[PDB]
CSV table of N, CA, C and O in Angstrom, one decimal:
chain,number,residue,atom,x,y,z
A,1,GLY,N,0.6,40.9,42.2
A,1,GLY,CA,1.3,40.8,41.0
A,1,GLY,C,2.4,40.4,41.3
A,1,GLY,O,3.0,39.6,41.9
A,2,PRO,N,2.8,39.4,39.2
A,2,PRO,CA,4.3,38.7,39.5
A,2,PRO,C,4.7,39.6,40.1
A,2,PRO,O,5.1,40.4,39.6
A,3,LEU,N,6.0,39.2,41.3
A,3,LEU,CA,7.4,39.6,41.3
A,3,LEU,C,7.1,40.8,42.0
A,3,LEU,O,8.0,41.8,42.1
A,4,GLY,N,5.4,41.0,42.4
A,4,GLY,CA,5.6,43.2,43.2
A,4,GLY,C,5.7,43.2,44.4
A,4,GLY,O,6.2,42.3,45.0
A,5,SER,N,6.4,44.6,44.1
A,5,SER,CA,7.0,44.5,45.2
A,5,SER,C,6.0,43.7,46.5
A,5,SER,O,6.6,42.4,47.8
A,6,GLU,N,4.8,44.4,47.4
A,6,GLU,CA,4.1,43.8,48.4
A,6,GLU,C,4.2,42.5,48.7
A,6,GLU,O,3.7,41.7,49.6
A,7,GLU,N,4.0,42.1,47.3
A,7,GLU,CA,3.3,39.9,47.5
A,7,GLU,C,4.7,39.8,47.7
A,7,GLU,O,4.6,38.9,48.3
A,8,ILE,N,5.8,40.0,47.4
A,8,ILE,CA,7.1,39.0,47.4
A,8,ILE,C,7.5,39.4,49.3
A,8,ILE,O,7.5,38.2,49.9
A,9,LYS,N,7.8,40.6,49.7
A,9,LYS,CA,7.6,40.8,50.9
A,9,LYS,C,6.3,39.7,52.3
A,9,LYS,O,7.2,39.6,53.3
A,10,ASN,N,5.0,40.0,51.9
A,10,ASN,CA,4.4,39.3,52.3
A,10,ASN,C,4.8,37.4,52.1
A,10,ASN,O,4.6,37.2,53.5
A,11,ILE,N,4.8,37.0,50.9
A,11,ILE,CA,5.5,35.6,50.6
A,11,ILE,C,6.6,35.8,52.3
A,11,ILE,O,7.3,34.5,52.7
A,12,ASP,N,7.4,36.6,52.0
A,12,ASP,CA,8.5,36.2,52.3
A,12,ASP,C,8.6,36.3,54.4
A,12,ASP,O,8.5,35.3,54.6
A,13,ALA,N,7.1,36.6,54.7
A,13,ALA,CA,7.2,36.8,56.1
A,13,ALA,C,6.5,35.9,56.0
A,13,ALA,O,6.0,35.4,57.3
A,14,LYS,N,5.6,35.5,55.2
A,14,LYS,CA,4.8,33.9,56.1
A,14,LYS,C,6.4,32.6,55.8
A,14,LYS,O,5.8,32.4,56.8
A,15,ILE,N,6.8,32.8,55.2
A,15,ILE,CA,7.7,31.8,54.9
A,15,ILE,C,8.6,31.8,55.6
A,15,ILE,O,8.8,30.9,57.2
A,16,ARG,N,9.0,33.2,57.0
A,16,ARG,CA,10.1,33.3,57.8
A,16,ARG,C,8.3,33.3,59.1
A,16,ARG,O,9.5,32.1,60.0
A,17,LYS,N,8.1,33.0,59.4
A,17,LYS,CA,6.9,32.7,60.0
A,17,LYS,C,6.8,31.3,60.2
A,17,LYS,O,6.9,31.0,61.6
A,18,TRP,N,6.5,30.7,58.9
A,18,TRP,CA,6.2,29.3,59.2
A,18,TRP,C,7.8,28.7,59.6
A,18,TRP,O,7.1,27.3,60.9
A,19,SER,N,8.3,29.0,59.1
A,19,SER,CA,10.3,28.1,59.3
A,19,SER,C,10.1,28.5,60.5
A,19,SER,O,12.0,27.5,61.0
A,20,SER,N,10.0,29.7,61.0
A,20,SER,CA,10.4,29.9,63.1
A,20,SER,C,11.1,28.4,63.5
A,20,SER,O,9.7,28.2,63.8
A,21,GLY,N,11.9,28.4,63.6
A,21,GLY,CA,12.4,26.8,65.0
A,21,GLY,C,12.3,25.8,64.2
A,21,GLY,O,12.0,24.5,65.4
A,22,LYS,N,11.5,25.9,63.4
A,22,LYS,CA,12.4,24.8,62.3
A,22,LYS,C,13.3,24.7,61.9
A,22,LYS,O,13.5,23.6,61.4
A,23,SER,N,13.9,26.0,60.8
A,23,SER,CA,14.8,25.9,61.1
A,23,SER,C,16.0,25.3,60.6
A,23,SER,O,17.1,24.4,61.7
A,24,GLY,N,16.7,23.5,60.3
A,24,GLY,CA,17.4,23.1,59.8
A,24,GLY,C,17.3,21.0,60.1
A,24,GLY,O,18.1,20.3,60.4
A,25,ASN,N,15.9,21.3,60.6
A,25,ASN,CA,15.0,19.9,61.0
A,25,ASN,C,14.2,19.7,59.8
A,25,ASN,O,13.0,20.0,59.9
A,26,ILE,N,14.6,18.3,59.1
A,26,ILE,CA,13.9,18.0,57.9
A,26,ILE,C,12.2,17.0,58.7
A,26,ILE,O,11.4,17.4,57.2
A,27,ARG,N,12.5,16.6,59.7
A,27,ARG,CA,10.7,16.0,59.5
A,27,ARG,C,10.1,17.3,60.6
A,27,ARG,O,9.0,17.7,60.0
A,28,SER,N,10.8,18.7,61.3
A,28,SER,CA,9.8,20.0,60.6
A,28,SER,C,9.2,20.8,59.8
A,28,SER,O,8.0,20.7,60.3
A,29,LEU,N,10.2,20.9,58.5
A,29,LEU,CA,9.1,21.1,57.8
A,29,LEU,C,8.8,20.4,57.5
A,29,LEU,O,7.4,20.2,56.6
A,30,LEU,N,8.9,19.2,56.7
A,30,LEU,CA,8.4,18.5,55.8
A,30,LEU,C,7.0,17.8,56.5
A,30,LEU,O,5.7,17.6,55.7
A,31,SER,N,6.2,18.0,58.4
A,31,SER,CA,5.3,17.9,58.7
A,31,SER,C,4.5,18.4,58.2
A,31,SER,O,3.8,18.5,59.3
A,32,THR,N,5.3,19.6,58.2
A,32,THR,CA,4.2,20.8,57.9
A,32,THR,C,4.1,21.8,56.8
A,32,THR,O,3.9,23.4,56.7
A,33,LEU,N,4.5,20.9,55.7
A,33,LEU,CA,4.5,21.4,54.3
A,33,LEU,C,3.4,22.0,53.8
A,33,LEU,O,3.1,23.0,53.4
A,34,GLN,N,2.3,21.6,54.7
A,34,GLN,CA,0.7,21.3,54.1
A,34,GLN,C,0.6,23.1,54.6
A,34,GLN,O,-0.8,24.1,54.2
A,35,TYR,N,1.3,23.8,55.4
A,35,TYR,CA,0.5,24.5,55.8
A,35,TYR,C,1.6,25.9,55.7
A,35,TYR,O,1.4,26.9,55.6
A,36,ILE,N,2.5,26.0,54.4
A,36,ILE,CA,3.4,27.2,53.4
A,36,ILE,C,2.6,26.9,52.5
A,36,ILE,O,2.7,27.9,51.7
A,37,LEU,N,2.4,25.5,51.5
A,37,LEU,CA,2.7,25.0,50.3
A,37,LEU,C,0.8,25.3,50.7
A,37,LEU,O,-0.5,25.1,50.6
A,38,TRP,N,1.0,26.9,48.0
A,38,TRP,CA,-0.1,26.7,48.0
A,38,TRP,C,-1.7,25.1,47.8
A,38,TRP,O,-0.7,24.3,48.0
A,39,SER,N,-2.7,25.5,47.4
A,39,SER,CA,-3.3,24.3,47.1
A,39,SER,C,-3.7,23.9,45.7
A,39,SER,O,-3.2,23.9,44.6
A,40,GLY,N,-3.2,22.2,45.8
A,40,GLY,CA,-3.0,22.0,45.3
A,40,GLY,C,-2.2,21.5,44.2
A,40,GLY,O,-0.7,21.2,43.5
A,41,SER,N,-0.5,21.6,45.2
A,41,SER,CA,0.4,21.7,45.2
A,41,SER,C,1.4,19.5,44.8
A,41,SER,O,1.6,20.2,43.6
A,42,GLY,N,-0.1,19.6,45.4
A,42,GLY,CA,0.4,18.0,45.1
A,42,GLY,C,0.5,17.5,46.4
A,42,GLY,O,0.9,16.2,46.6
A,43,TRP,N,0.9,18.0,47.4
A,43,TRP,CA,1.8,17.9,48.6
A,43,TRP,C,0.7,16.7,49.0
A,43,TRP,O,-0.6,17.1,49.9
A,44,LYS,N,0.6,16.1,49.8
A,44,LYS,CA,0.3,15.1,50.8
A,44,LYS,C,0.4,15.5,52.2
A,44,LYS,O,1.9,14.7,52.2
A,45,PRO,N,0.2,15.4,53.2
A,45,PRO,CA,0.3,16.1,54.6
A,45,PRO,C,0.9,14.7,55.0
A,45,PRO,O,0.1,13.0,54.9
A,46,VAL,N,2.2,14.2,55.9
A,46,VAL,CA,2.7,13.3,56.8
A,46,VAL,C,3.1,13.8,57.9
A,46,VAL,O,3.9,14.2,58.3
A,47,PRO,N,2.4,13.0,58.7
A,47,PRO,CA,2.2,13.3,60.1
A,47,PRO,C,4.0,13.0,60.7
A,47,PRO,O,5.0,11.9,60.0
A,48,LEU,N,4.1,13.4,62.3
A,48,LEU,CA,6.2,12.7,62.0
A,48,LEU,C,5.7,12.0,62.1
A,48,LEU,O,6.8,10.8,62.2
A,49,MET,N,4.8,10.4,63.3
A,49,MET,CA,4.8,8.9,63.1
A,49,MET,C,5.3,8.3,62.1
A,49,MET,O,5.0,7.0,62.2
A,50,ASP,N,4.8,9.1,60.5
A,50,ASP,CA,5.2,8.3,59.4
A,50,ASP,C,6.5,8.8,58.8
A,50,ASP,O,7.4,8.8,57.8
A,51,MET,N,7.3,9.0,59.8
A,51,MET,CA,8.8,10.3,58.7
A,51,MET,C,9.5,9.5,60.1
A,51,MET,O,10.6,10.4,60.5
A,52,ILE,N,9.4,8.6,60.4
A,52,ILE,CA,10.6,7.6,62.0
A,52,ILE,C,12.1,7.5,60.7
A,52,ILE,O,13.2,8.2,61.6
A,53,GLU,N,11.6,6.9,61.1
A,53,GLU,CA,13.4,5.3,59.7
A,53,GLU,C,13.8,6.4,58.5
A,53,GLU,O,13.7,7.2,57.5
A,54,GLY,N,14.9,6.5,59.0
A,54,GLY,CA,15.6,6.7,57.4
A,54,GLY,C,15.0,6.4,56.4
A,54,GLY,O,14.8,8.4,55.8
A,55,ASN,N,14.1,5.4,56.0
A,55,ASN,CA,14.0,5.8,54.5
A,55,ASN,C,12.3,6.3,54.8
A,55,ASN,O,12.4,6.5,53.2
A,56,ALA,N,12.0,6.0,55.2
A,56,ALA,CA,10.0,6.7,55.1
A,56,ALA,C,10.6,8.6,55.7
A,56,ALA,O,10.2,9.5,54.3
A,57,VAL,N,11.7,8.8,55.5
A,57,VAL,CA,11.9,10.6,56.1
A,57,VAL,C,12.5,10.7,54.9
A,57,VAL,O,13.0,11.7,54.0
A,58,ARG,N,13.4,10.2,53.9
A,58,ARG,CA,13.9,9.5,52.4
A,58,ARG,C,12.8,10.3,51.2
A,58,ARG,O,13.1,10.3,50.3
A,59,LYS,N,12.4,9.5,51.2
A,59,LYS,CA,11.2,8.8,50.8
A,59,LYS,C,10.2,10.4,50.6
A,59,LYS,O,8.9,10.7,49.7
A,60,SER,N,9.7,10.9,51.9
A,60,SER,CA,8.8,12.5,51.8
A,60,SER,C,10.2,13.8,51.6
A,60,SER,O,9.2,14.3,51.0
A,61,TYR,N,10.9,13.8,52.0
A,61,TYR,CA,11.7,14.5,50.9
A,61,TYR,C,12.1,13.8,49.8
A,61,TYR,O,11.8,15.2,48.8
A,62,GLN,N,12.2,13.6,48.6
A,62,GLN,CA,11.4,12.6,47.1
A,62,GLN,C,10.9,13.4,47.1
A,62,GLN,O,10.5,14.2,46.0
A,63,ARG,N,9.3,13.3,47.7
A,63,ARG,CA,7.9,13.6,47.9
A,63,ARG,C,8.4,15.4,47.3
A,63,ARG,O,7.8,16.3,46.6
A,64,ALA,N,8.7,16.0,48.1
A,64,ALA,CA,8.7,17.8,48.3
A,64,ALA,C,9.7,17.7,47.1
A,64,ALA,O,9.4,18.7,47.2
A,65,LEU,N,11.5,17.4,47.0
A,65,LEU,CA,11.3,17.7,46.0
A,65,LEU,C,10.8,17.2,44.4
A,65,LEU,O,11.0,18.5,43.9
A,66,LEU,N,10.4,16.5,44.2
A,66,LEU,CA,9.5,16.2,43.2
A,66,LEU,C,8.5,17.9,43.0
A,66,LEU,O,7.6,17.8,41.7
A,67,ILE,N,7.8,18.5,43.7
A,67,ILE,CA,6.9,19.2,44.2
A,67,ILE,C,7.8,20.5,43.9
A,67,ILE,O,7.8,21.4,42.7
A,68,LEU,N,8.3,20.9,44.7
A,68,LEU,CA,9.5,22.0,44.9
A,68,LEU,C,10.5,21.9,44.1
A,68,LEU,O,11.9,23.8,44.1
A,69,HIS,N,11.0,21.7,43.8
A,69,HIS,CA,12.8,21.7,43.1
A,69,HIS,C,12.2,22.7,41.9
A,69,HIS,O,11.4,22.0,41.0
A,70,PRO,N,13.1,23.4,41.7
A,70,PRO,CA,12.7,23.8,40.7
A,70,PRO,C,12.3,24.0,39.3
A,70,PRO,O,11.3,24.8,38.4
A,71,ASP,N,13.6,23.4,38.9
A,71,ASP,CA,12.4,22.1,37.0
A,71,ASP,C,11.6,21.4,37.0
A,71,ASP,O,10.8,21.8,36.1
A,72,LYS,N,11.1,21.1,37.9
A,72,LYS,CA,9.6,20.6,38.6
A,72,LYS,C,8.3,21.7,38.3
A,72,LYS,O,7.9,21.6,38.0
A,73,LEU,N,9.0,22.6,39.2
A,73,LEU,CA,8.2,23.7,39.1
A,73,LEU,C,7.6,24.5,37.9
A,73,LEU,O,6.1,24.5,37.2
A,74,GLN,N,8.9,24.9,37.3
A,74,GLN,CA,8.9,25.8,35.6
A,74,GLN,C,8.3,24.5,34.5
A,74,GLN,O,6.8,24.4,33.9
A,75,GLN,N,8.4,23.4,34.8
A,75,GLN,CA,7.6,22.2,34.2
A,75,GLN,C,6.4,21.5,34.3
A,75,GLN,O,5.9,21.1,33.5
A,76,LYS,N,5.7,22.1,34.9
A,76,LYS,CA,4.4,22.2,35.9
A,76,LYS,C,3.8,23.9,35.4
A,76,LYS,O,2.8,23.7,35.8
A,77,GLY,N,4.4,24.5,35.4
A,77,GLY,CA,4.0,26.1,34.8
A,77,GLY,C,3.2,27.0,36.0
A,77,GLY,O,2.9,27.2,35.9
A,78,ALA,N,4.4,27.0,36.7
A,78,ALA,CA,3.6,27.5,38.2
A,78,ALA,C,4.1,29.1,37.7
A,78,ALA,O,4.7,29.0,36.9
A,79,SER,N,3.3,30.2,38.6
A,79,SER,CA,4.2,31.2,38.3
A,79,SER,C,5.1,31.5,38.8
A,79,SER,O,5.5,30.5,39.3
A,80,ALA,N,5.3,33.1,38.6
A,80,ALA,CA,6.7,33.9,39.1
A,80,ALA,C,6.2,33.8,40.9
A,80,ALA,O,7.8,33.9,41.8
A,81,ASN,N,6.0,33.6,41.5
A,81,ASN,CA,5.3,34.0,42.7
A,81,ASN,C,5.7,32.7,43.2
A,81,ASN,O,6.6,32.7,44.3
A,82,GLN,N,5.1,32.2,42.8
A,82,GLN,CA,4.8,30.1,43.7
A,82,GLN,C,6.1,29.5,42.9
A,82,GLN,O,6.4,29.5,43.7
A,83,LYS,N,7.1,30.2,42.7
A,83,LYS,CA,8.7,29.9,41.8
A,83,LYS,C,8.8,30.2,43.1
A,83,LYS,O,10.5,30.4,43.1
A,84,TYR,N,9.4,31.6,42.7
A,84,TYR,CA,9.7,32.3,44.2
A,84,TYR,C,9.4,32.4,45.4
A,84,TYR,O,10.6,31.8,46.4
A,85,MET,N,8.0,32.0,46.2
A,85,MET,CA,8.2,31.0,47.4
A,85,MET,C,8.8,29.9,47.5
A,85,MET,O,9.1,28.6,48.6
A,86,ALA,N,8.0,29.2,46.1
A,86,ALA,CA,9.0,26.9,46.4
A,86,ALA,C,10.9,27.7,46.7
A,86,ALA,O,11.2,26.9,47.3
A,87,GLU,N,11.5,28.5,45.7
A,87,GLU,CA,12.7,28.6,45.7
A,87,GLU,C,12.7,28.7,48.0
A,87,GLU,O,13.7,28.0,48.0
A,88,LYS,N,12.7,29.8,47.8
A,88,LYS,CA,12.6,29.9,49.9
A,88,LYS,C,12.4,28.5,50.2
A,88,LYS,O,13.2,28.3,51.0
A,89,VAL,N,11.7,27.8,50.2
A,89,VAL,CA,11.0,26.5,50.9
A,89,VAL,C,12.5,25.8,51.0
A,89,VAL,O,12.6,24.7,51.0
A,90,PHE,N,12.3,25.6,49.3
A,90,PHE,CA,13.5,25.0,49.0
A,90,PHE,C,15.0,24.9,49.6
A,90,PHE,O,15.5,23.6,49.5
A,91,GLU,N,15.5,26.3,49.8
A,91,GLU,CA,16.5,26.6,50.6
A,91,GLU,C,16.5,25.7,51.8
A,91,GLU,O,17.1,24.8,52.2
A,92,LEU,N,15.7,25.7,52.5
A,92,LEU,CA,15.1,25.4,53.4
A,92,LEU,C,14.9,23.9,53.9
A,92,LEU,O,16.1,23.5,54.5
A,93,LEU,N,14.7,23.0,53.1
A,93,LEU,CA,14.6,21.9,52.7
A,93,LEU,C,15.4,21.0,52.7
A,93,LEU,O,16.4,20.6,52.8
A,94,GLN,N,17.1,22.1,51.7
A,94,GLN,CA,17.9,21.5,50.9
A,94,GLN,C,19.4,21.2,53.0
A,94,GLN,O,19.2,20.2,52.6
A,95,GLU,N,18.3,22.6,53.5
A,95,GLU,CA,20.0,22.7,54.4
A,95,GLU,C,19.6,22.1,55.2
A,95,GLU,O,20.5,21.9,55.5
A,96,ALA,N,18.1,21.2,55.4
A,96,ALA,CA,18.2,20.7,56.7
A,96,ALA,C,17.5,18.8,56.2
A,96,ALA,O,18.2,18.3,56.9
A,97,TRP,N,18.2,18.4,54.4
A,97,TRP,CA,18.2,17.6,54.6
A,97,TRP,C,19.6,16.6,54.4
A,97,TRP,O,20.3,16.5,54.6
A,98,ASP,N,19.9,18.1,54.3
A,98,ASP,CA,22.3,17.3,54.4
A,98,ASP,C,22.4,17.3,56.1
A,98,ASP,O,23.5,17.3,56.4
A,99,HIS,N,22.5,18.2,57.2
A,99,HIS,CA,21.7,18.1,58.5
A,99,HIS,C,21.6,16.7,58.4
A,99,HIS,O,22.2,16.5,59.6
A,100,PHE,N,20.2,16.5,57.9
A,100,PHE,CA,19.6,15.3,58.2
A,100,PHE,C,20.4,13.9,58.2
A,100,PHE,O,20.4,12.7,58.6
A,101,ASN,N,20.9,13.9,57.2
A,101,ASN,CA,22.0,13.2,56.2
A,101,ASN,C,23.2,13.0,57.1
A,101,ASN,O,24.6,11.9,57.1
A,102,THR,N,23.8,13.9,58.4
A,102,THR,CA,24.9,13.5,59.4
A,102,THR,C,24.7,13.5,60.4
A,102,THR,O,24.6,12.9,61.1
A,103,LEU,N,24.0,14.6,61.3
A,103,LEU,CA,24.1,15.3,62.6
A,103,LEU,C,22.6,14.3,63.0
A,103,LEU,O,22.4,14.0,64.1
A,104,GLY,N,22.0,14.7,62.7
A,104,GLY,CA,20.1,14.4,62.8
A,104,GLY,C,20.1,15.3,63.5
A,104,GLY,O,20.0,16.5,63.4
A,105,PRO,N,18.6,14.4,64.6
A,105,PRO,CA,18.2,16.1,65.6
A,105,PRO,C,18.2,14.9,67.1
A,105,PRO,O,19.5,14.6,67.3
């Protein structure tokens, strides 16, 4: 159910399994979003070879923002649990974006 404890803990666990060994790495997260997002989020898969140069990374990041940004989800009428899942994924994406723009991989 919306914000149900068992559902939320299950979402937590899926996000942990998905993000493991990817945290801080923007390409690792972007290249695998299709494995964590729900159906018809709008995400199109993007292989590592399409996110090599800086502007390609930035473009793919923009696309992820436009899906996962809490304001966009609210505006798209997402469910409470969708918003919860997105907030966790979006936190990971932001942390990785900041690393990309300074240290890289």
